[PDB]
Design a protein around this nucleic acid. Structure first.
Lengths: 73, 119, 155
RNA sequence: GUGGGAGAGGGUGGUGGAAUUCCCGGAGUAGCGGUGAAAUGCGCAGAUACCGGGAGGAACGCCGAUGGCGAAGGCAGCCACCUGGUCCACCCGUGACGCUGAGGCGCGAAAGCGUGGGGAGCAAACCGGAUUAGAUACCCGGGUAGUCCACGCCCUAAACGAUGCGCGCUAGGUCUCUGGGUCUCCUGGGGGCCGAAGCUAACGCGUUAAGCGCGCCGCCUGGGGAGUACGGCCGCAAGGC
């Protein structure tokens, strides 16, 4: 279903261009360093497209992960 | 014969065989088992049952070094990987956590034909 | 049986113990529908279980069936090429059919010249846990649990 | 022209992490691998599984789409520089400056060629294992060219929408990308689906035309012989036209 809550709604007015807001950016990542699909990010084609660059920039700087291990299984 | 107690258990599943390696709090192996270590030689080696036996063998042997608690780490998918993660939980060792850390490239090496036909 | 789930024929209880299970066993002894000779043999036998054994025949019998019922059996199956023998439970229904059949079979495998005796002695041996009947039973379980690797083909 | 905009459009340099291989250290034994089953193969000179360190090459997970860009071929990690195309609003400037385009010139996936470099993984040929009646194959283990870079060459393709370019005209509905607006929808450009009229042999096409028209280019004229022969032109060659 994927009807738990849109990451966008569950949040404030942020600058999608800001690559240092680990606080907010970290919100759009799966239970792994993976970037969530629009289905879950509640962003739009354009917004979501800008996020990616930001989340990637943040990865290089070391603020955001590239990938995390899964717990449970 | 060192007496560890707390450690890690690496479960390496695959469609051909399962091999469990137990280790100390920081990676160095204490003991290891597999589908071959025990009876099974060819196809049989894979099967979940083998995975089970191998898991147990791994724990039992590790019980010697005085193991008790372990963190499980699953790598890969294959003929009964869950059975291994179960035989452990039951083996006697208190399983602290199961974790999938199966490696995946961010697309690097062309895989052999057998694993291509994708994209 | 493509359509229905063929229900089990219900048998009229024994003319002495009023036990259906007995009729069943008697039917497995019978051959060419000579159900009298069949009934006789089982009763003569019950009286042979009374003499040589101070116990009530009926209880020796049921005890026997019990030890001769396999709880796991191997069923063949084609899985990617080879025909792997998959191990699996046995229905309560099938357990009986096999138990009774096996008894009569092993019983007729004994030496004693008298039919009624072979049954008498076979039943007893079965009760004790010995005899050709229980052999097959234990052989079956051994067969399974020895192929308990292909058991992930549950069926 | 001024002002807004989106983009894997192209070129150069840089750079990030994941994974594979190799090497080094540690701990650790007896197998690992692989299949329908196997075997070749690798491993006690210690493999496999596990931890740490290093070197090198190639590709760029998620986002990612039913998406976007380009004339096509084609193009996706991030960063900067250099650079092409394109849409919208205002209607401000020039005032028919337009369309098409034989030949020319240029670009042109892969494989392939020349010189030099590089080479982790993959892998024609090749060397083995198995399967088979045979197996010059499919499956398994290896493996050279090659696949990568530079410079030059080749110029082909199911190079496909199998649909040449421009312009005008002919119901709508629905989803979508990007701009404007009086922003529960209208308006412009693009991508899809369904469908009016109409077209079509049918299938189907249908404001993204295969409809109704005009302009210009290219091309077809039963099948095989044959994209062959010959001749010419191009190419180092293979070969191409």
């Amino acid at each position: 279903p994927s009807r738990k809550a849109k990451v966008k709604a569950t949040l404030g007015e942020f600058d999608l261009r800001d690559y240092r807001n680990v606080e907010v950016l970290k919100r759009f990542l799966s239970e792994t360093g993976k970037i969530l699909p629009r289905r879950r990010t509640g962003l739009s084609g354009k917004e979501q497209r800008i996020l990616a660059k930001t989340i990637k920039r943040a990865r290089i700087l070391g603020l955001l992960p590239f990938t995390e291990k899964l717990v449970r299984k | 014969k060192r007496q560890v107690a707390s450690g890690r258990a690496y479960i390496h599943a695959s469609y051909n065989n399962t091999i469990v390696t137990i280790t100390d709090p920081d990676g160095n192996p204490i003991t290891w088992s597999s589908g071959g270590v025990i009876g099974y030689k060819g196809s049989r080696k894979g099967t979940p049952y083998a995975a089970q036996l191998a898991a147990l063998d791994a724990a039992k042997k590790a019980m010697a070094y005085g193991m008790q608690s372990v963190d499980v780490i699953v790598r890969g998918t294959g003929a009964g990987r869950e059975q291994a993660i179960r035989a452990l939980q039951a083996s006697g060792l208190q399983v602290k956590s199961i974790v999938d850390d199966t490696p995946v490239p961010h697309n690097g090496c062309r895989p052999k034909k057998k694993f291509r036909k994708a994209s | 049986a493509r359509r229905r789930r063929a229900e089990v024929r219900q048998l009229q209880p024994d003319l002495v113990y009023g036990d259906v299970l007995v009729t069943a066993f008697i039917n497995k002894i019978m051959r060419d529908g000579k159900k009298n000779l069949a009934a006789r043999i089982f009763y003569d036998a019950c009286k042979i279980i009374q003499e040589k054994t101070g116990q009530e025949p009926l209880k020796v019998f049921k005890q026997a069936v019990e030890n001769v019922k396999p709880r796991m059996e191997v069923r063949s199956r084609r899985v990617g090429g080879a025909n792997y023998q998959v191990p699996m439970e046995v229905s309560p229904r099938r357990q009986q059919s096999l138990a009774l059949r096996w008894l009569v079979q092993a019983a007729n495998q004994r030496p004693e010249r008298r039919a009624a005796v072979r049954i008498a002695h076979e039943l007893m041996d079965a009760a004790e846990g010995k005899g050709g009947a229980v052999k097959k039973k234990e052989d079956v379980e051994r067969m399974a649990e020895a192929n308990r690797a292909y058991a992930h083909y549950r069926w």
